[PDB]
Structures are given as C-alpha cells and as structure tokens.
Design an enzyme around this catalytic site. Structure first.
Site, mmCIF file in Angstrom:
data_model
loop_
_atom_site.group_PDB
_atom_site.id
_atom_site.type_symbol
_atom_site.label_atom_id
_atom_site.label_comp_id
_atom_site.label_asym_id
_atom_site.label_seq_id
_atom_site.Cartn_x
_atom_site.Cartn_y
_atom_site.Cartn_z
ATOM 1 N N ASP A 169 29.117 21.087 -8.501
ATOM 2 C CA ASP A 169 29.123 19.635 -8.474
ATOM 3 C C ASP A 169 29.250 19.135 -9.899
ATOM 4 O OD1 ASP A 169 29.003 17.083 -7.616
ATOM 5 O OD2 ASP A 169 27.001 17.156 -6.798
ATOM 6 N N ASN A 173 20.156 -3.295 -18.896
ATOM 7 C CA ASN A 173 20.188 -4.107 -17.676
ATOM 8 C C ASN A 173 21.638 -4.130 -17.174
ATOM 9 O OD1 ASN A 173 20.366 -6.165 -15.650
ATOM 10 N ND2 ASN A 173 18.524 -7.194 -16.467
ATOM 11 N N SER A 208 22.829 10.126 -9.118
ATOM 12 C CA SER A 208 23.757 11.252 -9.063
ATOM 13 C C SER A 208 24.791 11.199 -10.163
ATOM 14 C CB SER A 208 24.469 11.274 -7.711
ATOM 15 O OG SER A 208 23.588 11.610 -6.645
ATOM 16 N N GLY A 209 25.060 12.347 -10.761
ATOM 17 C CA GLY A 209 25.969 12.445 -11.899
ATOM 18 C C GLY A 209 25.327 12.156 -13.250
ATOM 19 N N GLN A 215 19.086 8.743 -4.709
ATOM 20 C CA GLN A 215 20.423 8.163 -4.532
ATOM 21 C C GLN A 215 20.758 7.171 -5.633
ATOM 22 O OE1 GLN A 215 20.246 6.777 -0.505
ATOM 23 N NE2 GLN A 215 21.991 7.972 0.171
ATOM 24 N N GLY A 216 21.927 7.300 -6.230
ATOM 25 C CA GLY A 216 22.361 6.381 -7.282
ATOM 26 C C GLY A 216 22.158 6.929 -8.685
ATOM 27 N N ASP A 239 10.745 12.140 -8.732
ATOM 28 C CA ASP A 239 12.052 12.754 -8.442
ATOM 29 C C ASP A 239 13.167 11.768 -8.753
ATOM 30 O OD1 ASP A 239 14.092 14.444 -7.484
ATOM 31 O OD2 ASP A 239 13.215 14.585 -5.473
ATOM 32 N N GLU A 242 27.129 -3.565 -24.616
ATOM 33 C CA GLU A 242 27.964 -2.993 -23.530
ATOM 34 C C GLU A 242 29.362 -2.633 -24.023
ATOM 35 O OE1 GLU A 242 26.162 -5.797 -22.840
ATOM 36 O OE2 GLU A 242 24.826 -5.087 -21.236
ATOM 37 N N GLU A 291 24.690 0.314 -21.660
ATOM 38 C CA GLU A 291 23.993 -0.569 -20.709
ATOM 39 C C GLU A 291 22.496 -0.279 -20.726
ATOM 40 O OE1 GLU A 291 25.003 -3.198 -18.895
ATOM 41 O OE2 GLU A 291 26.630 -2.671 -17.460
ATOM 42 N N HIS A 306 30.712 15.136 -6.615
ATOM 43 C CA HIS A 306 30.538 14.337 -5.402
ATOM 44 C C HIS A 306 30.537 12.852 -5.661
ATOM 45 C CE1 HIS A 306 26.054 13.987 -6.080
ATOM 46 N NE2 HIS A 306 26.292 12.815 -5.522
ATOM 47 N N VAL A 317 23.301 -7.719 -16.196
ATOM 48 C CA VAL A 317 23.350 -8.819 -17.184
ATOM 49 C C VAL A 317 24.053 -8.361 -18.446
ATOM 50 C CG1 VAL A 317 22.012 -10.328 -18.640
ATOM 51 C CG2 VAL A 317 21.224 -9.822 -16.330
HETATM 52 CA CA CA Z 1 24.323 -5.172 -19.287
#
Ligand code: CA
Length: 223
Positions: free
Chosen positions: A84, A54, A177-178, A174-175, A171, A62, A52, A40, A57
């Site tokens: 899913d 932060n 997910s995956g 949103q965000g 829990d 990274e 990552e 989804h 920034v």
């Molecule tokens: Ca960063």
C-alpha cells in the site's frame, strides 16, 4: 486520529493533505517535488496541500500544488492492502521552508518498541464521525510482529508493521490513510489499515517504507 492531541500549527511540516474538492487522505513530503502516500488512496486529479493546519480555513503558509503524476506500486493488492504505497509528483516544486519541509527516508527498519509519531486529519472517534479542523497527533510504539497476528482477522504480510495500543482508545483512523509514521526522525510507515479504529486488541497497520527505499529512489530518478 482517535485519542490523540492537537499537534499545533506546522509542528509536523512534512505532513500533506490530499484534496479532491475536500480532504480525503494524508501524505508525506519526501523531497521538494515528491509526496509519498497509500496506494489505496489513489484518485485522479489530486491537489496536494502543503503547510496546512486548519484545513477548512486559509491561514497563509498554505501551498496548493496539483499532482502531475501519481504512481501506484505495481504489486499493490487492493484486497489485502499489501504494498500500500503510492508516489505523487507535484506539477511544480514546493517552496521549502520552516513550515513546509521534507522528511528523510529510513536507512534501516525500526525495531519493536520504538516510539513513533502518527498524524492526520482523520476521524477522532471510535463511534461516529468527527473530522477535526486542525492537524492531530498520536505517539505510539511499534508492536512485535507476534502481537499483531494474535490480534488479527485479516492477512498481515512482511510489508506491514503494526503500532498502537492493545488496550484500545489510541489509534489512527479513516481519513488518516496515506499519512506519516515517523520514528527517530525518519518516515518508517504509511497509515494503511486497521480493523476499525481504536478497538480493543485491534491495532493499526502501516506500510513498511524501509522495504521500499530502492523502489522510491529509483522511481523518483526515472520520472
Ligand atoms: Ca488552511
């Protein structure tokens, strides 16, 4: 993640962020060239972001690699979230090291009560919007299949387990997910859905990766 804690820069080195101009879903790195995430979350032109902490920034460590291909499960049901799962191939192999490493796939399913580690840059509030800069962690147990179902208005299939706290307050959300659910050093689940976040008697539901190992191994080999 609601009711969690700050993981701490690169304590969860298999955690990836999927970016389409901004973070939108989580993912888990399973080898140097493949990420696993939720069906989804599918979007075209995904930039996978490794190492990552932060997300707003540039800290060094990274790695930003584009998705060369994104394979959704052919049986994904967008209305029930059954199957899913999605596999993302990276355009170029990731540079594996202490801060960007892969997570093992499971050899058998995890039984109720096992403590797991869920993580991501998703919302951190039961009411309203509060997206963190830094990676967030939550430790939570798998609930029994009967528990999730008494406590549910939405279809639950055999490709989903559920984990969390019936009291509410702790829990994924949103965000996230995956993102990963790791138990005993193995990626057992993918953050899939819930009836809101952190609500009384409404735990989180997670794709049951142990059912998908053949399909992952096979898709990877033939792609
Ligand atoms: Ca960063």
């Amino acid at each position: 993640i609601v009711g969690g804690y700050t993981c701490g820069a690169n304590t969860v080195p298999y955690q990836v962020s999927l970016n389409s101009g901004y973070h939108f879903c989580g993912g888990s790195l399973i080898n140097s060239q493949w990420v696993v995430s939720a069906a989804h979350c599918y979007k075209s032109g995904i930039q996978v972001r490794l190492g990552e902490d932060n997300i707003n920034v540039v800290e060094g460590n990274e790695q930003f690699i584009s998705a060369s291909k994104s394979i959704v499960h052919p049986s994904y049901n967008s209305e029930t979230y059954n199957n899913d799962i999605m596999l993302i191939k990276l355009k170029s192999a990731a540079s594996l090291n202490s801060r960007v490493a892969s997570i093992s796939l499971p050899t058998s399913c995890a039984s109720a009560g096992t403590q797991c580690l869920i993580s991501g840059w998703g919302n951190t509030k039961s009411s309203g919007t509060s997206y963190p800069d830094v990676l967030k962690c939550l430790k939570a147990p798998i609930l029994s299949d009967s528990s999730c179902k008494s406590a549910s208005s939405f279809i639950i299939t055999s490709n989903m387990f559920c984990v969390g706290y019936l009291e509410g307050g702790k829990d994924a959300c949103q965000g996230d997910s995956g993102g990963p659910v790791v138990c005993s050093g193995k990626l057992q689940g993918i953050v899939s859905w819930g009836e809101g976040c952190a609500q009384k008697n409404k735990p989180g539901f997670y794709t049951k990766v142990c059912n998908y190992v053949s399909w992952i191994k096979q898709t990877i080999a033939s792609n």
